[PDB]
From Swiss-Prot, chain B:
Record lineage: Eukaryota, Metazoa, Chordata, Craniata, Vertebrata
Subunit details: Part of BBSome complex, that contains BBS1, BBS2, BBS4, BBS5, BBS7, BBS8/TTC8, BBS9 and BBIP10. Interacts with LZTL1; the interaction mediates the association of LZTL1 with the BBsome complex and regulates BBSome ciliary trafficking.
Disease: A chromosomal aberration involving PTHB1 has been found in Wilms tumor. Translocation t(1;7)(q42;p15) with OBSCN. Bardet-Biedl syndrome 9: A syndrome characterized by usually severe pigmentary retinopathy, early-onset obesity, polydactyly, hypogenitalism, renal malformation and intellectual disability. Secondary features include diabetes mellitus, hypertension and congenital heart disease. Bardet-Biedl syndrome inheritance is autosomal recessive, but three mutated alleles (two at one locus, and a third at a second locus) may be required for clinical manifestation of some forms of the disease.
Protein name: Protein PTHB1
Whole sequence portion shown: 642 to 690 of 887
Subcellular locations according to the entry: Cytoplasm, Cytoskeleton, Microtubule organizing center, Centrosome; Cell projection, Cilium membrane; Cytoplasm; Cytoplasm, Cytoskeleton, Microtubule organizing center, Centrosome, Centriolar satellite
Role played: The BBSome complex is thought to function as a coat complex required for sorting of specific membrane proteins to the primary cilia. The BBSome complex is required for ciliogenesis but is dispensable for centriolar satellite function. This ciliogenic function is mediated in part by the Rab8 GDP/GTP exchange factor, which localizes to the basal body and contacts the BBSome. Rab8(GTP) enters the primary cilium and promotes extension of the ciliary membrane.
Source species: Homo sapiens (Human)
Organ and tissue specificity: Widely expressed. Expressed in adult heart, skeletal muscle, lung, liver, kidney, placenta and brain, and in fetal kidney, lung, liver and brain.
Induction notes from the record: Down-regulated by parathyroid hormone.
Lineage top rank: taxon: Eukaryota
From Swiss-Prot, chain C:
Annotated organism of origin: Homo sapiens (Human)
Cell compartment(s), UniProt: Cell projection, Cilium; Cytoplasm
Protein name, per record: BBSome-interacting protein 1
Family to which the UniProt record says this protein belongs: Belongs to the BBIP10 family.
UniProt gene name: BBIP1
Disease implicated: Bardet-Biedl syndrome 18: A syndrome characterized by usually severe pigmentary retinopathy, early-onset obesity, polydactyly, hypogenitalism, renal malformation and intellectual disability. Secondary features include diabetes mellitus, hypertension and congenital heart disease. Bardet-Biedl syndrome inheritance is autosomal recessive, but three mutated alleles (two at one locus, and a third at a second locus) may be required for clinical manifestation of some forms of the disease.
A single Gene Ontology CC term: ciliary membrane
Location of this fragment in the whole protein: 26 to 80 of 92
Amino acid sequence: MEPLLLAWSYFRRRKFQLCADLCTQMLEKSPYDQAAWILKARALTEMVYIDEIDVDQEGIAEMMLDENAIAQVLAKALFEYIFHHENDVKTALDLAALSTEHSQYKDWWWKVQIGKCYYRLGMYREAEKQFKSALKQQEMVDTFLYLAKVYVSLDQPVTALNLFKQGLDKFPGEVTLLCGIARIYEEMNNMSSAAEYYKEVLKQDNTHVEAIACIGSNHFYSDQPEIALRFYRRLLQMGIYNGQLFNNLGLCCFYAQQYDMTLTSFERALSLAENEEEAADVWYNLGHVAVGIGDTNLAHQCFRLALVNNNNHAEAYNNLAVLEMRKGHVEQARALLQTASSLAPHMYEPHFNFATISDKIGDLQRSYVAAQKSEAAFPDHVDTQHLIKQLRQHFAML
Amino acid sequence: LQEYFELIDHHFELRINGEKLEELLSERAVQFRAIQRRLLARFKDKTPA
Amino acid sequence: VKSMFREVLPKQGPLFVEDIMTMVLCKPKLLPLKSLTLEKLEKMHQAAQNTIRQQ
């Protein structure tokens, strides 16, 4: 029959919305057809289907979004599957447990799926005993991304290492394993041993997008702003065309001293920006350009427009009120750093900068608790340790 | 101003009793969130729970 | 006699003689590139507002 074939042939070329209506057009022709019932099911599944976490691949982060280069460096089986886009985990778990007792082996898929249901809720240990048994029978790449996903959320960075060197020698040269191992090294900031693995996901597989930025960002910091451009002009030629990339392409050409593409790339980045909170960050990076040419009147209204397009931009409140202290507005500056700190209770830069305004005045009590948090949020700073010992001589005696 | 000073006190003591009935509910809500997390760590459809 | 072109540069610079305690700025940030799941999940959720804007 031509309707049943055209329904199945629409699923093969994944014309999904043209498939579900034509399949349910066959639904009233029968009391129950098992083939159309699962096809109406499975074409409705793949409309939206995401598996992993929001894995948004940064280039400039260490802890709670901090910057860098001033710190350092049967047929019911798919009927089960309709519950997994609806995320009703417990209801699916009954017929999952019903069917695995119906056939109590030869189903590693049902073994790893029930463990995925347990991780979807929060049953950590019950998942951790579940799909380990499936790995002892079957060699599958996603199961290594299942054992070594729950263990990192269980916070054991050495138990992630053994799986990422076990399956790497049964699936040699595999790509997404070699990206999973260099992603936990950036969590502990082990970039001595992270960026060698990201030189392997670029050795073979020379177009993986999320390991092109995370090398082309770790060269823009630590003073290779020309090599970091080469990783970003190549990422343009794949043809992704975001607004975030014309920001990063604008910054690398300026610091590499290439003054042609340095600023047209920002005007294309001001346009085609999605949210109103997003065009703030392109105005903010434009401010660091404007400090570089020396124009402060220009620079004063670049952070301001970043601030009126988005309040609670904590990196701009600090950055605007260094330009104020250059002019003389002390009480104006000391309130912006006062509210830059309360928006970012990390990120040492307002805390230390409070304790060189409030030290020149003479208030050595608030200028201690200021330069207290500029030690706890970033130790091994130089000019904090030349300031606490400057204050602790005043506190003992004359 | 003397009779005014009586009303500012028992309002403030009612604020003090307002500051006394609040901390007992919070830790028992911390007890209430701990018992939910004890449930969801345990609530599953098999034997040992 | 072709050209002089002698513009003698000083060959010396203003060396520092002490450090000064100064105020430093926040450093410029490179924006992250969102993944193809985050690009899909935002696009789906952005259309989820317009279908509830009419209903």
